[PDB]
Amino acid sequence: VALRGAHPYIAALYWGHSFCAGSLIAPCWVLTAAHCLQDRPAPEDLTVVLGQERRNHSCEPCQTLAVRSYRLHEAFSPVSYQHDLALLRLQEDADGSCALLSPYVQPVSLPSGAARPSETTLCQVAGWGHQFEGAEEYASFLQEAQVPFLSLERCSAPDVHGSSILPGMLCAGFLEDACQGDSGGPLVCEDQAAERRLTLQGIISWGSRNKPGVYTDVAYYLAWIREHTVS
Numbered sequence: 001v002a003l004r005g006a007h008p009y010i011a012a013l014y015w016g017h018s019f020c021a022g023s024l025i026a027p028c029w030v031l032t033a034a035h036c037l038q039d040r041p042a043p044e045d046l047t048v049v050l051g052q053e054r055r056n057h058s059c060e061p062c063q064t065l066a067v068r069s070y071r072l073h074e075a076f077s078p079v080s081y082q083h084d085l086a087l088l089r090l091q092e093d094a095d096g097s098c099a100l101l102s103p104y105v106q107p108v109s110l111p112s113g114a115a116r117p118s119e120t121t122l123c124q125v126a127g128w129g130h131q132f133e134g135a136e137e138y139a140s141f142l143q144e145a146q147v148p149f150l151s152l153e154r155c156s157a158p159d160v161h162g163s164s165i166l167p168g169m170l171c172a173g174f175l176e177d178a179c180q181g182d183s184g185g186p187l188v189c190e191d192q193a194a195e196r197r198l199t200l201q202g203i204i205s206w207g208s209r210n211k212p213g214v215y216t217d218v219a220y221y222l223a224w225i226r227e228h229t230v231s
């Protein structure tokens with residue numbers, strides 16, 4: 001029995017005329033890419049929607065929340081895209097409550113740390129993708145894709161991605177498709193060094209169609225994550 005949605009952890013981030021995807025990791029915390037927020041957008045500007053099916057559409061199970069604070073990695077290189085992750089702190093509603101777990105909204109598990117994915121480890125990426133301005137009624141539904149994992153040996157190679165792959169990045173893709181997937185968005189993969197079979201291995205970074213995708217390697221920042229969520 002399936003009493004939980006597809007990708008019920010996926011968060012949508014709206015401010016101004018800007019948009020990023022994200023990953024609910026606890027009911028009060030969302031994890032994204034750094035570069036979505038370089039410009040230092042004032043927390044009170046941002047809107048985050050959980051449990052959303054189509055981009056910028058409302059829906060019964062959608063929960064809209066305000067963001068009370070965020071932060072980017074100290075070492076985030078706006079040039080190289082290296083420490084590309086930020087945390088956002090949702091705003092506890094009246095009565096001290098962020099993101100009411102439902103079939104449509106549940107956090108996603110962080111990686112074991114001892115998640116050592118081979119290249120036949122199965123992985124999935126989800127998002128909305130490009131949508132044309134205007135005409136909210138012709139939105140697009142959440143989409144998904146199986147991507148194979150890509151060892152850094154094969155990814156860091158120059159016919160491929162070269163010295164552009166720094167520490168704390170990983171790749172998944174086909175060498176040879178990719179318009180779904182939004183900045184900030186989740187890559188989730190089989191783990192089995194956690195009780196929960198599925199874990200959050202990636203955040204969508206850069207990479208884009210004929211060349212692999214590059215992701216912040218979430219285990220790598222696993223301490224940064226706790227150091228900053230335990231608050």
Ligand SMILES: *[C@@H]1O[C@H](CO)[C@@H](O[C@@H]2O[C@H](CO)[C@@H](O[C@@H]3O[C@H](CO)[C@@H](O)[C@H](O)[C@H]3NC(C)=O)[C@H](O)[C@H]2NC(C)=O)[C@H](O)[C@H]1NC(C)=O
Nearest residue numbers: 014015016017045046047049055056057058062064065066
């Ligand atoms: C579709 O995209 C829009 C961006 O183009 C989103 O816009 C945001 O809507 C919010 C309300 O849903 C705003 O917040 C509210 O602001 C006023 C204060 O002036 C108050 O009335 C509300 O209480 C407050 N919300 C609170 C406290 O929770 C945002 O400021 C607004 N931002 C912009 C730039 O327009 C849509 O929400 C988004 N929707 C969906 C469903 O995807």
